[PDB]
């Protein structure tokens, strides 16, 4: 069993090329389904949700009375926009290998606690760089911690069947619970965290985080610069103490990788690149993370 | 077992109100899940997909270099935009009744044959009324016949469990098969047809088509004007011969209702309004259609 998370930057800038880019991950996903693995699939949406959200603003409101599309709704559109491209491609690749399996894309709502510190400190800048319907302009939005998901129960079961399931698109839509009632809110959820929570609920072995590096380095552009091959939480904690990692780029991926393997000798997390990910699953590339 | 299809006009004009409108259908859907029924849920997307597709055109391309969003991709966004609102609301309503069930939204790709006559006659007008990346401007787009769906196999199983499944959003994204390869194409699929094909594959009893009428009438604004209560394919065929029905508004719903009950004494199709749909399930309103 293997949960794979594909960054939003790997899906490109326009539909045109997103349709292109997505083939690569899909073919890789197909090949594992052959080696006998269960691949649960996920993806980020930084660029795609931004493109969609801008656009409703960008000019559409400018050049008319077009409606107000909060960020939640643009994440909804981002999921169906991306899920569409992935659903074809991975279905398509599986067929090249004459394999029979249902590829699914679940629209994803991610449960977060409403008292999350993150809201009280609106972190991630978003949308038009102007100086915009009433939010905390600076705009900006939080990054809540993912506690669960609307259909996990049913999702894990589809994974129990041999269904190749695509979930946690862009990390899912931030959803709080208020008086036994759901309420989508505006903001984002880090897709690595999201997919790591999912990786846990389905209880896979491996959690692979796809990213544009062969290894995560420490002391970069320094004499003691070193590439991590294997490693563990204990060390990552020190490395993190000394700010080894780009706050955002690598830190969240590291932390999310830790959250998954922590106290589970039977599971690893791999942070490798797209080209070299089959190698990566055999120590030959990327950085393995363990309890 | 009951498949319900909710028109796009019933979801409104803007997210603001779509979030409002969707509560009504959801509460109705909740109540059936209580009477012991399995409710498979579906919806159209005429207005929503248009709003999204315009917008990328409307001004966004005008007021910048924003990307080219074909209609397929705007249907992808329309599904995740709508699936989001439905997923909350119907989950929410089910909780008011303290019921425990997983509500799911499957991104939907609808298989059509590429030789479909419909393409060679681009029927349904779409997008900017100008006089637009190269399609058949007149623009316009076909309305293929739905032969199946990427995950029906897996979808019907989730329905076998007690999962309340939302599918065929906007009728699904038109997808042809070319050399064992899938290829989303531009155009639409009538959601009533789509949901009727689905109604069949899951093999429910009832297929309810929600629409803004208490009954389907014949000979409207004529002396012999009459409301249909029960009826059958044989008669509908004559009524259709004499153009009893609005080509588009009622015709497709009628035909789709026929396609489902035809040769199945154990199943009906109900064409009733939203306010009066629980009544409708008991002969008290709407028009029942039978083999």
Residue numbers in the entry:
A (entry chain A), B (entry chain A): 3 to 133, 142 to 148, 157 to 309
What does the paper say about this structure?
The arginine deiminase pathway (ADI) is the most widespread anaerobic route for arginine degradation in microorganisms and performs the conversion of arginine to ornithine, ammonia, and CO2, generating one mole of ATP per mole of arginine consumed. The ADI pathway is composed by three catalytic enzymes: arginine deiminase (ADI, EC 3.5.3.6), ornithine carbamoyltransferase (OTC, EC 2.1.3.3) and carbamate kinase (CK, EC 2.7.2.2). Here we have described the structure of the three enzymes that constitute the gene cluster in the ADI pathway in Mycoplasma penetrans (together with the specific membrane-associated arginine permease coded by arcD gene) and compared them to previous structures of the enzymes. In this regard, M. penetrans possesses and expresses the complete set of the ADI pathway genes at the same time while exhibiting a fermentative metabolism.
Carbamate kinase (CK) generates ATP from carbamoyl phosphate and ADP, and this constitutes the last step in the fermentative catabolism of arginine, agmatine and allantoin/oxalurate. Crystals of M.penetrans CK display a unit cell composed of one molecule in the asymmetric unit. Based on results obtained by gel-filtration chromatography, by predictions of the PISA server and by previous structures of CK from other organisms, the biological unit can be considered to be a dimer.,, the structure can be divided in two domains, with a large crevice in the middle that creates the binding sites for the two substrates, carbamoyl phosphate (CP) and ADP. The N-terminal domain (residues Met1 to Ala222), rich in α-helices, is composed by two sets of four stranded β-sheets, the first sheet constituted by four parallel strands from the central β-sheet and the second sheet smaller and formed by mixed β-strands. This domain contains three long α-helices, α1, α2 and α3, which make up the entire dimer interface, and the mobile PSD domain (“protruding subdomain”, from Lys126 to Val159), which is involved in the catalytic reaction by an overall “rigid body” movement upon substrate binding. The structure here of CK from M.penetrans differs from the previous structures by the presence of two sulfate ions, one in the carbamoyl phosphate pocket and another in the β-phosphate ADP binding pocket. The gap in the electron density maps corresponds to the flexible PSD domain (“Protruding SubDomain”), and only residues at both ends of the PSD domain and the internal loop from Ala143 to Val150 could be partially modeled in the electron density, all displaying high temperature B-factors and giving as a result a poor agreement between Rwork and the Rfree in the final refined structure. However, the putative coordination of the phosphate group of CP shown for the E.faecalis CK is not complete in M.penetrans, since the sidechain of Lys126 (Lys128 in the structure of the E.faecalis CK), which belongs to the mobile PSD domain, is not interacting with the sulfate ion.
